[PDB]
Structures are given as C-alpha cells and as structure tokens.
Amino acid sequence: YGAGQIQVLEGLEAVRKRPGMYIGSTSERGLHHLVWEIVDNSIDEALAGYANQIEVVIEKDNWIKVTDNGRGIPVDIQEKMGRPAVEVILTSSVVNALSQDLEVYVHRNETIYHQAYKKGVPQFDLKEVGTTDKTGTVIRFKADGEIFTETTVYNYETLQQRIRELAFLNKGIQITLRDERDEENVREDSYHYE
C-alpha cells in the first residue's frame, strides 16, 4: 500500500460519495454522460492525429463498448505509481469508479492487453491475452445501479443525436453507433463528415 495506491482508493471513495459533483447528476442525463466521458478521450486522440474511427455499441444488458483506432492507452510501467500507465489512467476515471464492471483491451506493440475493474478497483494485473496488427483502445463498462438509481437503460436517440453532432463538429472522424441489445433487431447509424 504505497502512497500512490492509497491516493487511488481515496479518489474512488470521493467519486462514489458525491457522483453528481463529477457527472452533473445520477439521473438519465448522468448515465449518458458516462458515454461522453469515454468518447471524449477518443475524439482528442483523433484530433491529435492518431485516430479516425470511433464505435459506440449498446450491448446486452446495457453495457457500453467504445472502440477507437488510436495509439492505444500506454501500458509501460510509469514512475509515479510503478503500475502500467493504462491502470493509472483508468483507476482515476470517473466512469470506472461509477461502473459496477469495466474492461479495457489495449491494442499496442502488436499485443492485446486486458484489465478488468469493479467500481474502479482492478480485479487482476494488466495481462497480455493475444496479438494484433492494429492499434487502439476498447472500453466496455456497465453503469453501477447503486449510483444510477433511476435508470441504467440507455436511450438510442439520445446517443444518436450527440454522436451525429460530434461527427459534424469533428470532421474526418467516422463515428458509428450500434444497438445490439436485441440480437434479432440490430440498429446502426454511421456518421462521417467531409
């Protein structure tokens, strides 16, 4: 329990104690804000010149999956924490703290790295699970029903409106929204402004 790891746990406690101060509310608006917090990272990575595709999927039981083709969150052991950079970044994430479960897959160094968390707490050390010829970041998360008491069900039209807006505002980025909650009836909208 180093000073860094203690700071992490205190940070998770603070976010879960007063979630509304971080994401505005714990209502339906707050639930959808989780998606924008993650997608904003991918947008910045695109604007920095390293990504051009973002995919948002509403998966079974209202998991959200966000994928980009950026550089991938770094996995090198950093100086401050002595932990992989990706773990440090995600253990300070408000979305992670307010999710009952969160998973990351980083495609980087021709390797796929995986870590999972519950309420921000890593469930195991970052591990290599496969290989890849792509780079990018995949985040899957399930909003915490203890925090989001009114609803944990996403509204497709709400996500659609803002995703369309984000593509219009950030030209060149292909942004795709897909609803896979009903496997028999799957909806997809893909936006790409020139």
Ligand SMILES: Cc1[nH]c(C(=O)N[C@@H]2CCN(c3ncc(C(=O)O)s3)C[C@@H]2F)c(Cl)c1Cl
């Ligand atoms: C979905 C998603 N995507 C990103 C993301 O793309 N983050 C970038 C990845 C590249 N970064 C690098 N930092 C240092 C790098 C290096 O090579 O040293 S690459 C900056 C952000 F972390 C994040 Cl964070 C999330 Cl969450």
Ligand SMILES: [Mg+2]
């Ligand atoms: Mg960033």
Ligand SMILES: [Mg+2]
């Ligand atoms: Mg493009």
